[PDB]
């Protein structure tokens, strides 16, 4: 669970989504990729 | 010398209005200018020319957008750690008279005659009252 104002994709399964005014970055099989804006 | 409508000669009315489906900002200024009393021709500033309104079922008044929850109600009391806060939906579920009374308290003027003009705001939030003996007229807005 990072908090950053410069989000990114890293692997081939990074899915940028937008939930409740927040640009989240998530992944299927990676706990470290999980993010928040 | 232009006419100054003395209070012992000027009359009062009785209207009712069911505010269901009406917005706050476009209802409250009309209920403010009615009891400010300017739609009558014989309006005078310094002497009250007010009316009587009765707003029925005031727990149905809606504001569009996301502001059934995002409308805050700040008030401070006087004891230093005692400023409180309740939101719009909680005020609606608790006491649906003060959602309209403070809305007209804003737009009505401020002073002794301001409280005098507030004294006629017989505003309820049910579907009955006890001034139908005064035979009111169903105004539409």
């Amino acid at each position: 669970m990072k908090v950053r104002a410069s989000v990114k994709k890293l692997c081939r399964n990074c899915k940028i989504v937008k939930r409740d005014g927040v640009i989240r970055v998530i992944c299927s099989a990676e706990p470290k990729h999980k993010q928040r804006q | 010398k232009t006419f100054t409508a003395k209070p012992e000669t000027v009359k009062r009315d009785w209207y009712v209005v069911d505010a269901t489906g009406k917005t706050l900002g476009r209802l409250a200024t009309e209920l403010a200018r009615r009891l400010r009393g300017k739609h009558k021709a014989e309006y005078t500033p310094h002497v009250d020319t007010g009316d009587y309104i009765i707003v029925l079922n005031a727990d149905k008044v809606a504001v569009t957008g996301n502001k059934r929850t995002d409308k805050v109600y700040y008030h401070h009391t006087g004891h230093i750690g005692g400023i409180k806060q309740a939101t719009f939906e909680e005020m609606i579920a608790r006491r649906p008279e003060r959602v309209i009374e403070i809305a007209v308290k804003g737009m009505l003027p401020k002073g002794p005659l301001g409280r005098a003009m507030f004294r006629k705001l017989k505003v309820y939030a049910g579907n009955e009252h006890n001034h139908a003996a005064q035979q009111p007229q169903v105004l539409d807005i």
């Binding site: - | 232009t2 006419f3 739609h39 009558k40 021709a41 309006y43």
Partner: protein, 58 residues
């Protein structure tokens, strides 16, 4: 003075920027004092005045 003029205008069913424009079409020079003072008492003559403004526009 403009207050009771606008009061009688909204009483009979017309605005103010149409009312003064119709009276300027009818080229009157009557001021706000006596235009209010007609609407104080004589309601049918001020009704005739806004009928004249509605007959100048319409």
């Amino acid at each position: 003075w403009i207050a009771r003029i606008n009061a009688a205008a909204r009483q009979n069913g017309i605005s103010y920027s149409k009312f003064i424009n119709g009276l300027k079409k009818a080229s009157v020079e009557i001021d706000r004092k006596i235009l209010a003072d007609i609407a104080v008492f004589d309601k049918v003559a001020f009704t005739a005045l806004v009928e004249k403004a509605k007959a100048a526009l319409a």
